[PDB]
Design a protein around this nucleic acid. Structure first.
Ligand SMILES: C[C@@]1(CO)[C@H](O)CC[C@@]2(C)[C@H]1CC[C@H]1C[C@@H]3C[C@@]12CC[C@]3(O)CO
Length: 865
RNA sequence: GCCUGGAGCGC
DNA sequence: AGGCGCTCCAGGC
């Protein structure tokens, strides 16, 4: 008849105003224009689907007793037809008996069983979730959304190509896309899998807001954006990351642009559009968004500030057509990211801050710390105050705009550097969810979707969607450490994905483990692979295919970064599978399964520790899935043969679980459980090797210890692991420490190294014992004093100062700025030497002969007692 | 040691 | 807006 193709990226549903309809936004190829343009496809008539569970025996709801008559499918039909449909207003519907499996948390529901499937328009009323009757004890699917029913039934798993048959035109345009179309029923949409992903339109932006002179509004005075119209998600980022860009500045209401501004620009030839009013600016922006038509908008702290601000201002200034910031034509703007995630429907939002938190560790995720760590460059800062003063001289405004441009360019580079977009696609293509959601973070949901697809495809009824804490079960086993320094090589054996393998090994699934604190029994080896095991099995196969492809030759060179990305996404998925089992709010929550996994975990660890011991080998440490062996040897080649020897022995015990040589140490300083320092062997040629320092858990790697303490401690660590004689070392450490103590007293240590960082678990206002907590105290100051406001998740930087108020150190906390700018404030040198440096060095040198607590305190110039 | 509150490393 | 195990600090009993 007729058909068109399109690559979908995002989906949206308005249950309240447009039930039974799902809007899909993506890309269509236009041959005439030789480029892809945005497209919106409206899918209608996605019907509610219910599953009524027939009773074994008919019940009288008044007496609560069987009536002697057994139940047949027809009984359910009739009760629904006569008493249910009527009472709740359902004119039409289709029904049909179907067989469905079940394996979830509602008791008295058979593993397999017949059900009365009832399908009817989403426009007619929704039944109560607890609805019961004379012929049925429960009904599933009452609250299932259309998006879920559509994605599950059509087997759509993340962005991909769709074939839409019998497309229809619309009276009037419903979206801001270049092409629109409508499908009358969902079975008109099909997935096609042998066509590559089209490149997207990416737009990175940043803005500068300014607090208004009189009262408290935060106006947008400048916006910068970088853009690229052909950004592949299946290959390396384009160089450069953008092709075009634009800048728009405005002025608050008390200020006036510096004289000659327009002219100063005409000269420099900068694409800076100078707008008279904030409202004009906003409108300029919204139009570029509408004209550029990005598929993805990337920024920093978008969901935490920028986006909400942009929307509020758009409303106050009554800027024209706010819904263009999204892809669907809408009238009313919802607020508070709910109203936000909805505000941009059709366009994916990538917030680098969120993406960084999921990909790397830092002491803070502010743009400057990310730029430093990720891009390795310094990023200037502009305090909200200095802004106005910049409106007096043109060269200053131009600097401000240029800065904003630099910010958007950094955000774009970070996004490129972390490979966020390509990873997100692979992740979404695996979980089978929605990419804008994958980008918002939250693993539980990617997990839900993956399982929902798995169970749907295997004929199971699935759970209805339902409408730090203290541990709820046993975790991993942590062997007791034989603290101390070692000179002989150390063997580190590791299991490859213990948890995921445990799950396949012992066939642990919702469909195989009987369950009701009490670890359930493993299933009988006779039963077939459970649904969950098969899913992990698949991830493991695909990851093997990929690593094998990577070993290939005469290959397209860029393909290797691609395989590497998919490989990691396949790993992240499999591992999250476990953690979801243990999440109380997960749609597929199942503590029993989780706990059974960690159990066989501990068990296997011990049988392993024991076995290495029966081989007359010393086992000095072990954490959840690893075993550290002290060979007492000095012959590297022999060490390896030993490892491979133990290896062969353990791997002989299982069908899928495998242990391997994760490495070898030349020297190791084991302080406590989950805390050590070591020199790692990196073989080269002829049995030779180089050595690299690796730290784990020591205060040195934490963010809640100033750099002064961390740098000193690392020094001591380098010494300790060295080749020098024990005495050479002990001397060097003393030499150094005493120096540090002086440098601290004389004031030669940079004010930066005294900074301590801590992240707030709650919003600074939700802390009762406030005052006694440094970071929280400092956060309140910052919030109540200036612009941006610290909130849960944010890391606060501070330093202890001499107030001259005789309060404990924990009550004399200030911001680095509050220190250098204020005079009566001065670094509490005493605190840092005794409460920072000393503690760290003390705990590191504990197993060291020659070094002691009182001995260290004197070197720094402290009274031993 | 424990308790209360608060940190974030480890797998 | 996936888990649990193991230190560290401030303060007081
Ligand atoms: C945090 C979480 C939750 O599943 C996530 O998948 C990252 C890996 C994770 C930390 C896991 C919790 C259990 C951890 C044990 C380690 C690391 C681990 C996943 C399994 C392990 O790799 C050992 O099997």
């Amino acid at each position: 008849e007729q058909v068109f193709h399109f690559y979908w990226l995002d989906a949206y549903e308005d249950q309240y105003n447009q039930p039974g309809v799902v809007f899909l936004f993506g890309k269509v190829w236009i041959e005439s224009a030789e480029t892809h343009v945005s497209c919106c496809v409206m899918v209608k008539n996605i019907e509610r689907t219910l599953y009524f569970l027939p009773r074994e025996m008919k019940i009288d709801l008044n007496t609560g007793k069987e009536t002697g008559t057994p139940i047949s499918m027809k009984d359910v039909y009739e009760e629904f037809d006569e008493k249910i449909a009527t009472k709740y207003k359902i004119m039409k519907f289709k029904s049909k008996p179907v067989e469905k499996n079940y394996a979830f948390e509602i008791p008295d529901v058979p593993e397999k069983s017949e059900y009365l499937e009832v399908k009817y328009s989403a426009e007619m009323p929704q039944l109560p979730q607890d609805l019961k009757g004379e012929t049925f004890s429960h009904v599933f699917g009452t609250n299932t959304s259309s998006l879920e029913l559509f994605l599950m039934n059509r087997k759509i798993k993340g962005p991909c190509w769709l074939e839409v048959k019998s497309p229809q035109l619309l009276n009037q345009p419903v979206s801001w896309c270049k092409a629109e179309a409508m499908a009358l029923k969902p079975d008109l949409v099909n997935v096609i899998k042998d066509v590559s992903p089209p490149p997207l339109v990416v737009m990175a932006f940043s803005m500068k807001t300014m607090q208004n002179a009189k009262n408290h509004q935060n106006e947008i005075i400048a916006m910068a954006a970088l853009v690229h119209h052909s950004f592949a998600l299946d290959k390396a980022a384009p160089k450069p990351p953008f092709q075009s860009h634009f800048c728009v500045v405005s002025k608050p209401k008390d200020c006036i642009f510096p004289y000659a501004f327009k002219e100063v620009i005409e000269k420099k030839n900068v694409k800076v559009e100078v707008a008279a009013t904030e409202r004009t600016l906003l409108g300029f922006f919204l139009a570029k968004v509408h004209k550029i038509d990005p598929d993805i908008i990337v920024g920093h702290n978008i969901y935490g500030f920028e986006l909400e601000v942009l929307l509020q201002r758009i409303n106050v200034c009554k800027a024209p057509h706010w819904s263009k910031i999204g892809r669907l034509k809408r009238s009313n703007m919802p607020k508070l990211g709910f109203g936000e995630r909805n505000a941009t429907c059709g366009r994916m939002i990538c917030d680098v801050e969120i993406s960084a938190k999921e990909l790397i560790r830092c002491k803070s995720y502010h743009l400057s710390e990310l730029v430093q760590q990720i891009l390795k460059t310094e990023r200037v800062v502009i305090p909200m105050e200095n802004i106005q003063n910049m409106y007096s001289e043109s060269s200053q405004l131009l600097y401000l705009l240029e800065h904003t441009w630099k910010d958007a360019k950094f955000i774009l580079q970070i996004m490129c550097e972390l490979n966020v977009l390509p990873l997100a696609l692979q992740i979404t293509n695996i979980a089978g969810n929605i990419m804008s959601r994958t980008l918002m973070g939250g693993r539980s949901e990617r997990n839900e979707f993956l399982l929902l697809h798995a169970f749907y495809e295997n004929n199971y009824i699935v759970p209805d969607k339902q409408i730090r804490k203290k541990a709820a079960y046993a975790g991993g086993l942590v062997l007791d450490p034989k603290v101390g320094f070692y000179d002989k090589f150390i063997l580190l054996l590791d299991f490859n994905s213990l948890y995921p393998s445990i799950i396949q090994e012992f066939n642990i699934c919702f469909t195989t483990v009987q369950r009701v604190e009490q670890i359930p029994e493993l299933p009988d080896p006779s039963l077939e692979m459970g649904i969950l095991p098969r899913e992990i099995r698949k991830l493991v196969e695909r990851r093997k295919q990929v690593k094998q492809l990577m070993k290939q030759q005469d290959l397209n060179p860029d393909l290797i970064l691609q395989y590497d990305i998919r490989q990691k996404a396949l790993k992240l998925t499999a591992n999250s599978m476990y953690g979801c089992l243990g999440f109380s709010y997960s749609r597929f929550y199942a503590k029993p399964l989780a706990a059974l996994v960690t159990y066989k975990g501990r068990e296997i660890l011990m049988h392993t520790k024991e076995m290495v011991q029966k081989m007359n080998l010393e086992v000095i440490y072990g954490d959840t899935d690893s075993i550290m062996i002290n060979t007492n040897s000095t012959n590297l080649e022999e060490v390896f043969k030993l490892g491979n020897k133990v290896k062969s022995e353990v791997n002989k015990l299982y069908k899928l679980l495998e242990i391997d040589i994760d490495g070898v140490f030349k020297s190791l300083l084991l302080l406590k459980k989950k805390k050590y320092a070591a020199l790692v062997v990196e073989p080269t040629s002829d049995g030779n090797y180089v050595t690299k320092q690796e730290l784990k858990g020591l205060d040195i790697v934490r963010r809640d210890w100033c750099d002064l303490a961390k740098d000193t401690g690392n020094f001591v660590i380098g010494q300790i692991l060295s080749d020098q004689s024990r005495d050479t070392i002990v001397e060097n450490i003393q030499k150094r420490l005493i120096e540090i103590g002086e440098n601290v007293l004389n004031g030669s240590v940079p004010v930066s190294q005294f900074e301590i960082n801590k992240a707030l678990t709650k919003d600074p206002q939700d802390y009762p014992d406030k005052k006694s907590l440094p970071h929280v105290h400092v956060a309140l100051w910052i919030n109540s004093q200036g612009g941006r406001k610290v909130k849960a998740g944010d890391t606060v930087s501070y330093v202890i100062c001499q107030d001259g108020s005789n309060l404990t150190a924990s009550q004399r906390a200030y911001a680095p700025e509050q220190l250098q700018k204020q005079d009566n404030l001065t670094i509490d040198t005493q605190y840092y030497l005794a409460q920072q440096i000393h503690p760290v060095v003390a705990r590191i040198c504990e197993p060291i002969d020659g070094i002691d607590a009182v001995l260290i305190a004197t070197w720094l110039g402290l009274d031993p007692t």
